[PDB]
Amino acid sequence: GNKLFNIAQRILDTNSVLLTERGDHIVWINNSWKFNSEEPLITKLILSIRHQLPKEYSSELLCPRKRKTVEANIRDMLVDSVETDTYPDKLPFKNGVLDLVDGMFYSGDDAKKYTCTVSTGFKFDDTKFVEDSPEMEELMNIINDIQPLTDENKKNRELYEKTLSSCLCGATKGCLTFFFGETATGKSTTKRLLKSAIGDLFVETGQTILTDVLDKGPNPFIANMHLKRSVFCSELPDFACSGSKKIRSDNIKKLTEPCVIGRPCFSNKINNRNHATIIIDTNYKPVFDRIDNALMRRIAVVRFRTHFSQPSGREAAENNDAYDKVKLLDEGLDGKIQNNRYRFAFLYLLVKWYKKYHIPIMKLYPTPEEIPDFAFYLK
Amino acid sequence: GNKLFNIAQRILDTNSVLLTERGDHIVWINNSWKFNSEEPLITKLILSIRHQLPKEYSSELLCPRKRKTVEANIRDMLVDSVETDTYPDKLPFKNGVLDLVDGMFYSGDDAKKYTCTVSTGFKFDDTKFVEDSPEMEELMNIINDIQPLTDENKKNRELYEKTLSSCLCGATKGCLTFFFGETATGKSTTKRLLKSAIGDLFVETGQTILFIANMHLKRSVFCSELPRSDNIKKLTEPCVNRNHATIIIDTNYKPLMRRIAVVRFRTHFSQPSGREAAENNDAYDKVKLLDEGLDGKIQNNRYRFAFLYLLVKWYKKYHIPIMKLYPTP
Amino acid sequence: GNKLFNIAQRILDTNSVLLTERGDHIVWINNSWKFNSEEPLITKLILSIRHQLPKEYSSELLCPRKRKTVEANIRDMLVDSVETDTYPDKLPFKNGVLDLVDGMFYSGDDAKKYTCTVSTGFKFDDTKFVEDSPEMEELMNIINDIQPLTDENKKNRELYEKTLSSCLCGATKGCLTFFFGETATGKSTTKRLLKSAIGDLFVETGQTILTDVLDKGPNPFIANMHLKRSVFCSELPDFACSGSKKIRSDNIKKLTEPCVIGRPCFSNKINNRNHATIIIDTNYKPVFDRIDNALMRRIAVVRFRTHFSQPSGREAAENNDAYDKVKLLDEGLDGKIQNNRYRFAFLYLLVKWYKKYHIPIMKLYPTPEEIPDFAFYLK
Amino acid sequence: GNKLFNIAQRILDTNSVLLTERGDHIVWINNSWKFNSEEPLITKLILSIRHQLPKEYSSELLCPRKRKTVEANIRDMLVDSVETDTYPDKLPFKNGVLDLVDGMFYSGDDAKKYTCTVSTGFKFDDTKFVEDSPEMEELMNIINDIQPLTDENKKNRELYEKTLSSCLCGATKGCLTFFFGETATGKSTTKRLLKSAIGDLFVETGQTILTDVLDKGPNPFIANMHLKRSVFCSELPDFACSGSKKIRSDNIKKLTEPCVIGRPCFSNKINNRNHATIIIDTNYKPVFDRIDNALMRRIAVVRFRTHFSQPSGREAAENNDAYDKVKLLDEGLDGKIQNNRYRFAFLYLLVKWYKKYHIPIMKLYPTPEEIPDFAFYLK
Amino acid sequence: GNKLFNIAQRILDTNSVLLTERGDHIVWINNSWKFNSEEPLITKLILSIRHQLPKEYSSELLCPRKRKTVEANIRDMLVDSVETDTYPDKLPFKNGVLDLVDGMFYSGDDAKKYTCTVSTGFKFDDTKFVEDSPEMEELMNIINDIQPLTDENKKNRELYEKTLSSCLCGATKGCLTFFFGETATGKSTTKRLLKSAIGDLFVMHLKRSVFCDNIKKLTEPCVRNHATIIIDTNDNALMRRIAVVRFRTYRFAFLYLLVKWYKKYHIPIMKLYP
Ligand SMILES: Nc1ncnc2c1ncn2[C@@H]1O[C@H](COP(=O)(O)OP(=O)(O)OP(=O)(O)O)[C@@H](O)[C@H]1O
Ligand SMILES: Nc1ncnc2c1ncn2[C@@H]1O[C@H](COP(=O)(O)OP(=O)(O)OP(=O)(O)O)[C@@H](O)[C@H]1O
Ligand SMILES: Nc1ncnc2c1ncn2[C@@H]1O[C@H](COP(=O)(O)OP(=O)(O)OP(=O)(O)O)[C@@H](O)[C@H]1O
Ligand SMILES: Nc1ncnc2c1ncn2[C@@H]1O[C@H](COP(=O)(O)OP(=O)(O)OP(=O)(O)O)[C@@H](O)[C@H]1O
Ligand SMILES: Nc1ncnc2c1ncn2[C@@H]1O[C@H](COP(=O)(O)OP(=O)(O)O)[C@@H](O)[C@H]1O
Ligand SMILES: [Mg+2]
Numbered sequence A, C, D: 001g002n003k004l005f006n007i008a009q010r011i012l013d014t015n016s017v018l019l020t021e022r023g024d025h026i027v028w029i030n031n032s033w034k035f036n037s038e039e040p041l042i043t044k045l046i047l048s049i050r051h052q053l054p055k056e057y058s059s060e061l062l063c064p065r066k067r068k069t070v071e072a073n074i075r076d077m078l079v080d081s082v083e084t085d086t087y088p089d090k091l092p093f094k095n096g097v098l099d100l101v102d103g104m105f106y107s108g109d110d111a112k113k114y115t116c117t118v119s120t121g122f123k124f125d126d127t128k129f130v131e132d133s134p135e136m137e138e139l140m141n142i143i144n145d146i147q148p149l150t151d152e153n154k155k156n157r158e159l160y161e162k163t164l165s166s167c168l169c170g171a172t173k174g175c176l177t178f179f180f181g182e183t184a185t186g187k188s189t190t191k192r193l194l195k196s197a198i199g200d201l202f203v204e205t206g207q208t209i210l211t212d213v214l215d216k217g218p219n220p221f222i223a224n225m226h227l228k229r230s231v232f233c234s235e236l237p238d239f240a241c242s243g244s245k246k247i248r249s250d251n252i253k254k255l256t257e258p259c260v261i262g263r264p265c266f267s268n269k270i271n272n273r274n275h276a277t278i279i280i281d282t283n284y285k286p287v288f289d290r291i292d293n294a295l296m297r298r299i300a301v302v303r304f305r306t307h308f309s310q311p312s313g314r315e316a317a318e319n320n321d322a323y324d325k326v327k328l329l330d331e332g333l334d335g336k337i338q339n340n341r342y343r344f345a346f347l348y349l350l351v352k353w354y355k356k357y358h359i360p361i362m363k364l365y366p367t368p369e370e371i372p373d374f375a376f377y378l379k
Numbered sequence B: 001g002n003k004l005f006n007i008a009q010r011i012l013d014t015n016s017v018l019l020t021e022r023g024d025h026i027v028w029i030n031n032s033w034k035f036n037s038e039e040p041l042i043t044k045l046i047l048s049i050r051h052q053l054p055k056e057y058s059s060e061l062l063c064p065r066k067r068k069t070v071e072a073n074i075r076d077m078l079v080d081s082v083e084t085d086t087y088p089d090k091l092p093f094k095n096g097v098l099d100l101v102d103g104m105f106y107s108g109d110d111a112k113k114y115t116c117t118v119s120t121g122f123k124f125d126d127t128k129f130v131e132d133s134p135e136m137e138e139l140m141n142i143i144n145d146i147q148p149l150t151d152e153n154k155k156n157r158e159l160y161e162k163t164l165s166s167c168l169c170g171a172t173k174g175c176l177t178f179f180f181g182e183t184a185t186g187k188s189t190t191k192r193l194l195k196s197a198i199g200d201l202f203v204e205t206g207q208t209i210l211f212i213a214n215m216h217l218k219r220s221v222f223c224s225e226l227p228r229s230d231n232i233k234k235l236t237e238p239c240v241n242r243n244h245a246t247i248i249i250d251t252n253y254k255p256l257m258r259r260i261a262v263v264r265f266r267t268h269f270s271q272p273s274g275r276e277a278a279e280n281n282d283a284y285d286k287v288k289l290l291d292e293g294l295d296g297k298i299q300n301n302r303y304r305f306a307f308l309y310l311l312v313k314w315y316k317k318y319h320i321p322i323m324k325l326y327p328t329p
Numbered sequence E: 001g002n003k004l005f006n007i008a009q010r011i012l013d014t015n016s017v018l019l020t021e022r023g024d025h026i027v028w029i030n031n032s033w034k035f036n037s038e039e040p041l042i043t044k045l046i047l048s049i050r051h052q053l054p055k056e057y058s059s060e061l062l063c064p065r066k067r068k069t070v071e072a073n074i075r076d077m078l079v080d081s082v083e084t085d086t087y088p089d090k091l092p093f094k095n096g097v098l099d100l101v102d103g104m105f106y107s108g109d110d111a112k113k114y115t116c117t118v119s120t121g122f123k124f125d126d127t128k129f130v131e132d133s134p135e136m137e138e139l140m141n142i143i144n145d146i147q148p149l150t151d152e153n154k155k156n157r158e159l160y161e162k163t164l165s166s167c168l169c170g171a172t173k174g175c176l177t178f179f180f181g182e183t184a185t186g187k188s189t190t191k192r193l194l195k196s197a198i199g200d201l202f203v204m205h206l207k208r209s210v211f212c213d214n215i216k217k218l219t220e221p222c223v224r225n226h227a228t229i230i231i232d233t234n235d236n237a238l239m240r241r242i243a244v245v246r247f248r249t250y251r252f253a254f255l256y257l258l259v260k261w262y263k264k265y266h267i268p269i270m271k272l273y274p
C-alpha cells in the first residue's frame, strides 16, 4: 500500500518515540530518552532504527527527502500523551538507568520502562563504581577533612550526608538547605564535587528567584530548573547593609511546592516539575522579611567549620572563634575536580549514603534550632 | 469530480471539525474535542477518520503531502462559527463526558453533542467511580480530619462542601473563596486532592491578578502565597476568555462585601515532638499526628476517583436546581 | 548503494565535524575548529573536503542542492556530544595550535587533537617568533619604560609579568587584577599591546558586570565572555561622588567561579565557561559595599608609575608624587600598535614570561596589603 | 565540470566579493565597497559582473534562479575573514577614493586596494574641485565672516580649521571639541556646511552619549557612530537649573578610545570602531561631575564671536560683550546650503586644511585654559 | 489567456473585496464585511463566490494550490484604498443595515453599499421589531420605574432620553454625560439593557458608546471617536462639555424605543447640549 507508512508503523510498534504532556516528542536512541524543542530528533531515530527493519525497509531510509515524510507520518500518529519521570528512585545515565535501592545497573530494554527524560549526561563506566580504589581513598580523606567525624560534629555531618544524598531521587523535596560557612571552608569544593558526580541533573541559578517577584515577565531561571534534581544558589550578600533586599518569605513556599510556576522566553508553559534540592551557598546569616510557622518548617542549615589555608596565613586562623580546624590548602585539588577524577567515587559514596537514610521513604526535616531569630521564635 | 475535495466534504459531513468564534479549529479524535492554537491538529484527524471512508478513498490518506491539501480544503470551508461549551452541568474526560444531574457517563457519539473543547485529560476508568472502596474510606477519614463535622463546624463544613463541589460546573460563578488558615491545616492537601480529582481543569497563577490568557474555559483557578478591590469585580464577570472557573486564594493571614466568601481551617497536623506546642494554641481546635506518607500517595493519584465521586455526590446536594455562591460577611 | 550517504559516512570517518554540548556543530577547515550558530558552516567543510574523496565522489560535490543533502545526512549522525576546550596550556591560532610548555607550533592533524574552538584570529608567521629583531628591541624598551626594572619596582614588575602572561592558559583564574595608576601612565598602551598580541581571545565589557546584578534579563556582557582568555573593564568612575554605586562584592566572587550564569539575547544558555583573566583598568582606588576575607583573597593590584608627557607640561609632572619617573611622550606609538608592529614580539615576550612562573601549576595570588581599607581590615 | 561552479570560481578570482570579520559580505559594484546585512547584495554583483565573463557564461546569469545558485556557492568559498578600513588618509566617495596626502583622485582597480566600507554617499564631480569659482569666493566670504582672520582670533581660527579638517581622516581622534557661542553666531551653519561636504560620514546624536550610562540595555546612538568620521551633538541645556544632570566624565574617557562599547537593537556586536571627531554644539559653558587631569587632555573648545542679526535688532547687539562683530543676516543663505551649493568648495577647503596640519602625524591637542573651572584646576 | 486571471477579474467585478487606508483587506461573506489582518480570509471568498461563476471557472476553484493564485492576483490588483463608515446614521446588524432616518431595514447588496465594519453582534429578528409585545410592556414599566415621567423630572427624563438616543448614530459626539446617582437605583441595569440592545458596538475605535485635557481629548473626531462617553458614578472650556442627569428611584423592543427616541430630537442634526 504505502511503504513509507508501513515503516512508520513498524517504528511506532517498538515504542521508541513517545509524546509527552508538555508537547515534546521524547526519542529513545543510544539508551537514553532525549528531547530538544528546536530540532525534530525523530529524524535521527529513523536513521538509528534503520538497522532493525527488513532489508527493503532499510535501504530507503538513507535519504533526507524520504526521512521527513516518515517523520511527518509519525508526528500524526502520536495522539495520546504519556506521563514521564514517575519513578523517583532512579538515576538515569547516558547509557542506562541505575536503581538506587539495590545498586544494580540497567541497560537497553530494561531501562526503557522507567521513562526518565533527563539524564546525568555521561556514560556509566562499570569498572569505576567500586568500593576500593585510590581515588575513593583520597576522596574519603577530602570529605573527612571538609566535615570532620567528631562527636560534637556528628549531627551536622549526618545532615550534610543526608542533604547531599537527597540529590539523587526525583521526589519533591519539602525543605531548603543552607550552606552557611566562613571563607575557604569547603562549600564550593562540595558544589563542584556534586556537579561532577550527578552531571546534567545539576543547575546553579541566581538569587533573583530567592528574593524577587518570580511571576512578572519571562524568567528562564525557573524554566531551566524543570526536572533538575539539584539546584544551587550563590549571590548571598549581607542584608545588614542599606539597599539590600531581604529574602522573600513567599518565594520559599513557592519553591517548595511540587509544580512551580514560571514561563520561559518565547513560550507559554508555566508549569515546571519540582524535583530540585535547593541549596543556598551562603556566607552570612540570612534574614527574611517576616518570620512565621510557614517558614520554620522549611529551613535546614549545615555548618562548615574546617578551614584550608596556606602556611603564611595559618597563624591568623587559629584564634578565630567561628573556626574549628585549620587544614593545609591543596593548590592542585581544584585542578583534579574538573578533570572528573572523583566522579564515580563520589557517585558511590552518594549511593551508599542514599541507601542509609532514604530507603523506606524520603523526607527532609527542618531544624531551626540553628538560626538566632528562629531560636528567639522558639522561646 | 475531485477526489481530494470529495474527501474534505465527507470529513466535514461527519461534523468532526468545527470552527470556534475564538478563531481556533477544534478536532474530534479519541472521543474528545481537542484544540491547540499552535499546531494543525486537523492533519491528525484526516488520518484517524481514514477507517471511515471507502477503500479507494482511504489508501490515498497515507501521504503527508496529500494530507495537507485536504486540510487546506477543510480550512477553506469552515466559514460559519459554532459556539462551544454551553452546557455547564457536564464534566469532560479524555474518553467521554459525565453528566452531573444524573451521574451517567456518556461516551462515543453521545459525547459529541456537548461541544466540550476542554477536558480533564485522563481516561474515565469505569471500575473506580464506586461508593464503597478502601481508598474511599481513607479519603473520607482524611476529609473528616481536615474539617470535622462538629456542631460548631457544620456551617463551615457546608460552605467548604459547596465551594469544593462548585469546581465541576462550566458556568460563571460570582463569588471568590478564601482559604484563610494557619500552617499545616490542609490547604495544599485540598488543592492537591482537587488536582488529582479534576485534572487539567486546574490552574494556579501569581498574586498579580489580585496568566489571564490561561484562565480560559478552565474550571478552577487558585492563587497561593498571599503576604485590589476592583480586581474582584473584574474577575467575577463572564468575559475576562470565558471566566467559567472559581477563584480560590491560599493565604495564611487575614486579608465587594457581597462577593467574598471565607472558609476556615482549624485542624493542625504535627509530629509527636511538637504536639504539645499546638495544644495550648487558640488557632487550632484539634491536633492530629502528621501523615508523612499521605503526600506520596497523592501524586500517584490513589484518591483520584474517590474524590471525584465525593465531588459528584457533593454537587448533587446544593447546585441541582441552580448554581450560586453566597458571600459570608 | 547510496553515494550521498557514503560521502557523509566518509566525512564522519575523518572526524572533521563534531557536535558540542552547547548544541554547536563545530567544523574543521584550514587548521582551525570554526563554529557559527547562525550559519551551517558544515556546508563549507562539505565543499572544502571535496579534494579528499575519490573522483566519482568529488565531482558530485559541486552543487548546493546536493551539498545541503549531505549536511542533512550528517546532522542525523551526530548523536553524541564531545567536550571541547579541555587542554589549558595551548594557544590556538587561525592556522594551528601553539604548545606553551615547549614553544612548539602544531598544525594539521596534530592540531586537531586539542579541540580549541576559540582561536586568536590571525595566522602564525614563523619568521617573526624570534628573539633578535628591531621590533623586539623597541618593544622591550617600551615595556621597560612602562614598568622599570628598579629595586623598589621589582615585586610589581614580576606581578605585572605574571598577570600579563596568565592571559594564555585556558584554566580558571580566581584573582582579579586592578590596573590602578594616574593619567598618561600606560594602562591603555598595555591593553592595546595585549589585544594586538592575543587577538580574538580578548574582550572588554562595561563596568555593569562589576557593580550590577548580572541576572535580571539578558546580559550580553556576561554572555560574550565564554572561553575568552582576557577581559578588560574600563570606565571605573570615582565612587567618592554622590549617587555612585559601589562595586558589588559578590560579583567578584562570581567572576572567579569556573562557570558563570548570564543569558544572551534570543537564546537560553545560562552556562558560560570562565577562562578569563579579569583586569580592571581604573584611575582611582576602588571601594566596595563590604570588605571581608572572602574578598581580600581574590584581589591583586599592580601599580603604574612612569608618566608620559609633552615638554610643555613636563615641569608640572616632575613635582607630582604620583609619578616616580617622567618620560617623553611618543606621538607615533599609538599608530604603530593598530598596525600590529609589536604583535609577535609581544607574543614571544608573553610566552617567555609564561614558561617562567606558570610551568608547574597556574595560580594567581592576591596582594591584600596594597589597598588602604584592606590594609585596615587585616589588623 | 560545472558551469555554475566555474562562474563562482571566476568571480572569486577577481576578489569582487569579500567576507568581513563582522559577518558581512561586502560587495564591490559601481567602484564602491557596499554591504547591507538584511539583503544579500551578492546577487547584484552576480549580475553586474555579467559583462566580464565569456559569452557562454554571461547570457546564463539573466535568471534569478541561477543567481541564487552562484550566490549559494560563493557564500561557501569564503572562509578567510578580512580586515577593513585600515588606511586613515583616504576619503571614500560613491564612485572612488580620494587620496588626501596628494589631493589626487582614484577610481577603479587602484581604488579597490583600500577596503573602505563606508562612503560619503555622493559622486565626486571632478570639474568642481577647483581653486577659483564664484561658489568658492562666497564660501570664503562666509567662513571669514564666521571666523574673522584678526590677530586676536588667530589661534581660535587655526583650531577651528584643524577641528573641521580632522573630519576626513579614519584614525581615532582622542579629544572632544566644543562649539561654544551665543545666539545666531554660526554653529548650525558650520554643521550644515560640514554635512553637505562629507555627507554620509557624519551623524548627529543626542546628549545621551554625553550624560547617561551608555551601558544599560540597547543604545542605537553608539551603534550608528561606527566608522563615522564626524559626530555632532547639539542641545546642551543649561545645567544651572534643577535636576539637570552633569556630563559624565567617564563617558568622555570612553568616547576617545579606539573601539567603543555599545550594543544595537536586534544584534549582539558590542565593539564599534571609533573613527569619529566628536563636536558638541553647545550654547552655555558646560560643567562636569568631577574634574581631574584625565579630563584636561581630552577637551578643546572654539569660540564663535560674529553675530548675525536683522537691522531691526541691530542696535541691541552692538553693546553686547558676547559679540565682537555684527554682520547682516542672509535670509537666502540657509536655502543655498541644503542645495549643496558649497559642497565641493568646502571639500577643497577641508583638504587644503588637511595638508596644512595633519600631514606628518594627525593629532588633536586640548585647550584646558579656556574654561574657568579647568583654569582653576590648572595649578 | 488565464482562467486564474479572469476569475480574479470577475471576483473584483462584483466588488466583494476592498482595501482600506489602514492596510486591511475587508472581505464580504455571510452578508457582513468581516475583516481581520491576521487571517487571510480572501481564500474563503474564492470558494464562497464559487457558486456564482461559470462551471468551467468554478470547477478549477476546488484546488488549494490554484486558490492562492487567484488570491495572489486579487491581492496585487487592489491599488486604490477605500474609506469606511461614512454614514453616521446607520446600524449594522449581522444580516443587514438598519437606516436610522426612517427605520427601514436593508439586507444583501443594498446592505453592501454601507461599508460598515463593526456590527452589533446579533442577528435581526424580523418579527420582533414591533410595537405591541408583552416584553415591551414589561420593559416600558421597568423604564418608568427607573425614571418616572413626572413634571419635576421632565427635564431630567428628557436629557436621559436624548443621552440614550445618542448611542445609536455613528457621528462624532462632543458632550460628556454623567450618571450621578446613589446605589440600588438602576444605572447598572440600564447599562445591561443597553448592552443587550446594541451589543458589540458598546464597550475604543469605531464604537458608539463608552461606559466608565482628557475631557477635550475624548471629544474630538480623531483620537475615530464615535462613542458617547458616560461615567457611572456614585474653566469655561470645561462647562461646555458636561451634562448631568440624576438617578433617584427585551432587546429589540429596547432598540425600537431607542429609535423612536432618536427620531424626536436628532432628525435634522445631532448635537448634545452641555
Ligand atoms: N580536603 C582538602 N584538603 C586540602 N585542600 C582542600 C580540601 N578541600 C578543599 N580544599 C581546597 O581548599 C580551598 C577551599 O576553597 P573553597 O572553594 O572550598 O572555599 P569557599 O568556602 O567556597 O570560599 P569563599 O568563602 O571565598 O566562597 C580550595 O582551594 C580547595 O581546593
Ligand atoms: N487528614 C490528615 N491526616 C494526617 N496528616 C494529614 C492529613 N491531611 C494532611 N496531612 C498532612 O499534613 C501536612 C500539612 O501540610 P499542608 O498541606 O496542610 O500545608 P499548608 O496548609 O499548605 O501549609 P502552610 O500554611 O505552612 O503554607 C500535609 O503535607 C500532609 O502530609
Ligand atoms: N614607552 C613609551 N614611550 C613613549 N611613549 C609612550 C610609552 N608608553 C606609552 N606612551 C604614550 O604615552 C601615552 C600614555 O597614555 P595611554 O594612551 O597609554 O593611556 P593612559 O595612561 O591609561 O591614560 P588615562 O589614564 O588618562 O586614561 C600615550 O600617548 C602612549 O602612546
Ligand atoms: N557669513 C554669513 N553672512 C550672513 N549671514 C550668515 C552668515 N553665516 C551665517 N549667516 C546666517 O545667520 C543666521 C545664524 O543662524 P545659525 O544657524 O548660525 O544660528 P545658531 O548659532 O545655530 O543659533 P542659536 O544658538 O540661536 O540656536 C542664519 O540665518 C545664517 O544663515
Ligand atoms: N426599576 C427597577 N426595575 C427592576 N429592577 C430593579 C429596578 N431598580 C432596581 N432594580 C434591581 O436592583 C438590583 C441592583 O440595582 P443596581 O443596578 O445595583 O443599582 P445601581 O444602578 O444604583 O447600582 C438590580 O439587579 C435590579 O434588578
Ligand atoms: Mg566559594
Ligand SMILES: [Mg+2]
Pocket (backbone or CB within 6 Å): B187, B188, B224, B250
Ligand atoms: Mg501551602
Ligand SMILES: [Mg+2]
Pocket (backbone or CB within 6 Å): C187, C188
Ligand atoms: Mg586609557
Ligand SMILES: [Mg+2]
Pocket (backbone or CB within 6 Å): D187, D188
Ligand atoms: Mg543652532
